[PDB]
Design a protein around this ligand. Structure first.
Ligand SMILES: O=C1N[C@H]2NC(=O)N[C@H]2N1
Ligand SMILES: O=C1N[C@H]2NC(=O)N[C@H]2N1
Ligand SMILES: O=C1N[C@H]2NC(=O)N[C@H]2N1
Ligand SMILES: O=C1N[C@H]2NC(=O)N[C@H]2N1
Lengths: 123, 121, 123, 121
């Protein structure tokens, strides 16, 4: 649902996710990470299932943040893939992939995998 | 390099990816998968490092596709994370996450992982 | 440390992991899953860093369970990769990959990825 | 098929994997990586479906390598999960997880993921 996803969300590391769910299935907003070679806000763009099921199923969605802004460039991008679960305590449970740009040689070790949970605060 | 991400790419499954990379890091286009509960094109949006490093590195990028369009709603979303490398042969090497919208009971098995390599061939 | 890893462990799904850490860096034991096309115990085999660092670093380790035993055969295998963190509340935090055997055609969708946390109970 | 997993396999990085598949599902052998903070062989142990399905499916298997041996201790472990397919050309297609032992502060970035394909060539 757009309304449920739109808002301010934070995860266990203390990072901030600000998102708006457009009715066409789009997500736009900013991401502030609490860890990494990252400083300030970064632009995020994603997509979500604007039409989930009447099943207590989560709404699938995903987004990307390239870790480059006007203050820093970390030459990497992360994509979060998870599902939004609404209710009184709405959560977005995800798994993510962080890929750094590398030489063909260190490519075998270019992606880190992790998982974050987001708790909503504001709309 | 970078600006050369714009174009039509194909992966080993025969899926077609059409992207436009914008001056500031945005990625926009349509995706058409050869496999799955998917038909026709789906919209995709992503981001890429618009200022990759000397050095001899690839350009990090990623994008998302919610598999819902005027034809099908497969209640899932896929995100590809990888890097683009240009040269006589340019490719995009990625690892993807496909999450379906499940009930809690099946949440443990909601995400598939795989890897795709795209070329303009 | 072998002693710290050896014991009975359970995760958030309610599955049981019984393991013994041999001094050569080996792990052997049984796994009982609470979910899936699984019934009874399954054999697990793994390896761990018998020599972690004097740094509050976790001990890296991994293990595999082929979901075949005398009662069921699910034609799949899972590998858990994580780190053991000892203390009063010892945990093993992992990320796992579950691969099912498939036809070359459905191979694109043969692996599921997830993460489990194990809490120790007994040695 | 299955019993044919025994042998020496090589992956695209040039790493060598030597395994013995036992009648009941066990996998034993040594691994030697072409890349990383690793030197010589390391011991590996794993498991495989000793009774794969008609159908036309691969045999699911997985194994672990703790990168510690009499030469180096890289304080990490890698697990490969995949399936073996036999035929004139047999391969093992895998996705792996490499976890390093970190302090909590760096736990978020302790696991790398990748994919390897092994052949007997
Ligand atoms: O909040 C964060 N999530 C994690 N994933 C990532 O790429 N950086 C970390 N920060
Ligand atoms: O091209 C495709 N890549 C794979 N991942 C995914 O989500 N669907 C499949 N199609
Ligand atoms: O305890 C379990 N862990 C999960 N991973 C897996 O493969 N099956 C599930 N059961
Ligand atoms: O052959 C290798 N595979 C890759 N994964 C890993 O752990 N080290 C690398 N070497």
């Amino acid at each position: 649902a757009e309304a449920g996803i739109t808002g301010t969300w934070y995860n266990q590391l203390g990072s901030t996710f600000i998102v708006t769910a457009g009715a066409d299935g789009a997500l736009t907003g900013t991401y502030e990470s609490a860890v990494g070679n990252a400083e300030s806000r970064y632009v995020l763009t994603g997509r979500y299932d604007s039409a989930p099921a009447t099943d207590g199923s989560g709404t699938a969605l995903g987004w990307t943040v390239a870790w480059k802004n006007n203050y820093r460039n970390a030459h990497s991008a992360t994509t979060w893939s998870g599902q939004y679960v609404g209710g009184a305590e709405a959560r977005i449970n995800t798994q993510w992939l962080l890929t750094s740009g590398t030489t063909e040689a260190n490519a075998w070790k270019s992606t880190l995998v992790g998982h974050d949970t987001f708790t909503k605060v504001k709309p």
